[PDB]
Design a protein around this ligand. Structure first.
Ligand SMILES: [Cl-]
Ligand SMILES: [Cl-]
Ligand SMILES: [Cl-]
Lengths: 96, 95, 88, 94
């Protein structure tokens, strides 16, 4: 997608949290990043495991919230997981 | 729409934070977050709303707000305020 | 301790003689709030806490928002007895 | 450990924050906070410890840290890390 390429291009090299969304706008994964640019882009290039590739297949859009520090990105991450209870956070949590 | 509620709506800032909508008994019945507390809180008492949100609205006699320095902080505050007050309408307005 | 209390928001942890955190509260001003416990009249529920309070510490915060978030994290950490039973 | 852990202990910062102790597997097994990450992390690998803490020390293969900027933040971060990782020694050492 074109809108999506543009979103990816102007991603900041800043810490924060990203929210992956499906076609219908439902949050499906929440993550923390030391660099939002590096982490969000990493989902749209290279190779990933089977369970992560399924996440990747469902990604229609994303959003992010910049924080002042890695410490604040961690805190925000856990609060956003509580708020949205995203399907891929529970599925991808344990090992394998 | 009592006078006390009008005077409180007039002071809302153009700042992020959270709001705590309250009974005519003073109990917190909804917690939400806003990038602009002014726009968001005022939106409840003007225009149209869905049937469920209408019921919350008819239950509001008061509100409190807590300003944050950032949206990120508003979101952290929101989830802590929900845990603290376990509000009715956070359960019921759930998708 | 009471004399050095600052006029800043934050959280205070009221403690036992035995050293346990028996209540966690949030203050817009630590100075006023903490001192208020040992002055004026008091409701019964609050009076019991006071007789039990042997010591305390506080954590200052930069905002009321931060004090609220801190409060809930401290309550989770310590699960103080009087927070359970002074349910407002 | 060998050269790696010693160097990694050498470059701990004199900054407050939370530390994450990890086992050989990479799993977070303990979360704590410190006014000095350098002082607190190093203390696990030096001196004497009680029985409970020696079991933890025996299992540490690595560590990570997150620097904080206030007493309030460090506490909040700590509680959030514990929730995230549910570390076994936070359970056993409580
Ligand atoms: Cl939190
Ligand atoms: Cl040091
Ligand atoms: Cl982490």
């Amino acid at each position: 997608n074109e809108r999506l390429k543009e979103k990816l291009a102007v991603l900041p090299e800043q810490p924060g949290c990203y929210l992956m969304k499906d076609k219908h706008g439902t949050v499906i994964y929440v993550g923390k990043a030391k660099s939002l640019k590096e982490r969000v882009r990493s989902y749209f290039t290279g190779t990933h495991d089977g369970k992560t590739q399924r996440l990747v297949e469902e990604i229609a859009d994303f959003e992010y919230i910049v924080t002042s520090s890695n410490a604040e990105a961690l805190i925000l991450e856990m609060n956003l997981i509580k708020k949205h209870d995203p399907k891929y956070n529970v599925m991808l949590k344990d090992d394998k």
